[PDB]
Each structure stands twice: as structure tokens, then as C-alpha cells.
Design an enzyme around this catalytic site. Structure first.
Site, PDB file in Angstrom:
ATOM      1  N   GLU A  35       0.821  -1.210   0.000  1.00  0.00           N
ATOM      2  CA  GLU A  35       0.000   0.000   0.000  1.00  0.00           C
ATOM      3  C   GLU A  35       0.853   1.257   0.000  1.00  0.00           C
ATOM      4  O   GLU A  35       0.521   2.220  -0.689  1.00  0.00           O
ATOM      5  CB  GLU A  35      -0.950   0.026   1.202  1.00  0.00           C
ATOM      6  CG  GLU A  35      -2.035  -1.053   1.178  1.00  0.00           C
ATOM      7  CD  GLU A  35      -3.152  -0.732   0.196  1.00  0.00           C
ATOM      8  OE1 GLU A  35      -3.134   0.409  -0.319  1.00  0.00           O
ATOM      9  OE2 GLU A  35      -4.035  -1.591  -0.043  1.00  0.00           O
ATOM     10  N   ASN A  46      -8.000   9.168  -5.208  1.00  0.00           N
ATOM     11  CA  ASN A  46      -8.895   8.249  -5.886  1.00  0.00           C
ATOM     12  C   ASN A  46      -9.763   8.984  -6.896  1.00  0.00           C
ATOM     13  O   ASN A  46      -9.911  10.207  -6.852  1.00  0.00           O
ATOM     14  CB  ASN A  46      -9.792   7.542  -4.880  1.00  0.00           C
ATOM     15  CG  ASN A  46      -9.016   6.784  -3.833  1.00  0.00           C
ATOM     16  OD1 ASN A  46      -8.067   6.066  -4.141  1.00  0.00           O
ATOM     17  ND2 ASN A  46      -9.433   6.925  -2.579  1.00  0.00           N
ATOM     18  N   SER A  50     -11.895  11.284  -3.276  1.00  0.00           N
ATOM     19  CA  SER A  50     -11.369  10.990  -1.962  1.00  0.00           C
ATOM     20  C   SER A  50      -9.870  10.690  -2.063  1.00  0.00           C
ATOM     21  O   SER A  50      -9.309  10.557  -3.150  1.00  0.00           O
ATOM     22  CB  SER A  50     -12.130   9.822  -1.355  1.00  0.00           C
ATOM     23  OG  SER A  50     -11.894   8.634  -2.091  1.00  0.00           O
ATOM     24  N   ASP A 101     -15.455  -4.464  10.191  1.00  0.00           N
ATOM     25  CA  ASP A 101     -16.758  -4.032   9.710  1.00  0.00           C
ATOM     26  C   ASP A 101     -17.461  -5.097   8.874  1.00  0.00           C
ATOM     27  O   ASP A 101     -18.552  -4.837   8.355  1.00  0.00           O
ATOM     28  CB  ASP A 101     -16.627  -2.711   8.935  1.00  0.00           C
ATOM     29  CG  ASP A 101     -16.015  -2.876   7.558  1.00  0.00           C
ATOM     30  OD1 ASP A 101     -15.738  -4.017   7.127  1.00  0.00           O
ATOM     31  OD2 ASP A 101     -15.831  -1.826   6.893  1.00  0.00           O
TER      32      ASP A 101
END
Length: 129
Positions: A35, A46, A50, A101
Site C-alpha cells: 500500500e 482516488n 477521496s 466491519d
């Protein structure tokens, strides 16, 4: 800060990521390598406007506030700049909420595409932990 491989592994372990929600430490080191190349200052924009921040490239659409992602959420209740610090605590605490999540580490595209299904233990080999 640009972490060394074993230096990052040690920091992630101290902060409780080893086997967090079933993911061994090498998964987290592999994800960080691909990453951000272990660089806490990494940012990437992005297509939807964002931005991804820090060593684990956490996205402002959902998880932090950067003042420039309209209609977004701030589920980690932090400014995104906190994720660029040489202290990885904010990034780790927010990653714990993300991986919890329901989607696990599939939230990180580089993990899904470059770490999932490989021998991720090689990323912590030779380290004193």
C-alpha cells in the site's frame, strides 16, 4: 518516516495487530509494503475525489476527515493528517475498526491482490519479535 521491515513488524505487534480478527502479523506487514512501501507520509488520490492516507492507505470517503471529500463520513473520528504521523497508533486503531466491519482485510485492494493466498510469514522472517 520510512520503516524498516522488522521495525514495522515490531511496532504492529506492540499495538495488538498480530492475529487481530484472525490475521497473522505477516498479513499486515505485506499490506503495508504494497500500500505505501512502508512510508507513513504516502498519499494517493482516488477517482471519486477521496484520498488514501498513510502506511495503510486509509480512505477519506468513510474513515477520516480531510475537509475536501463532500458527503463523506469520518468513522474513525480523526483528521486524515493524523494518519501520516511517524507514530502509527492512529493508523492501527482505525485499521482495527475497518477490519471489523464485516469484510476483513479485503478492504485493502493491495492485500487482496498481492498478499492473500501467499506465504505472508516470509514478511516477518528473521525479525526478532
Amino acid at each position: 518516516k520510512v520503516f524498516g521491515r522488522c521495525e514495522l513488524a515490531a511496532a504492529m505487534k506492540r499495538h495488538g495487530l498480530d492475529n487481530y480478527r484472525g490475521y497473522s502479523l505477516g498479513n499486515w506487514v505485506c499490506a503495508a509494503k504494497f500500500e505505501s512501501n512502508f512510508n507513513t507520509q504516502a498519499t494517493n488520490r482516488n477517482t471519486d475525489g477521496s484520498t488514501d492516507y498513510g502506511i495503510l492507505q486509509i480512505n477519506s470517503r468513510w474513515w477520516c476527515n480531510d475537509g475536501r471529500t463532500p458527503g463523506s463520513r469520518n468513522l474513525c473520528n480523526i483528521p486524515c493528517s493524523a494518519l501520516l504521523s511517524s507514530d502509527i497508533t492512529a493508523s492501527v486503531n482505525c485499521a482495527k475498526k475497518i477490519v471489523s466491519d464485516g469484510n476483513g482485510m479485503n478492504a485493502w485492494v493491495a492485500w487482496r491482490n498481492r498478499c492473500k493466498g501467499t506465504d505472508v510469514q516470509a514478511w516477518i522472517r528473521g525479525c526478532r519479535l
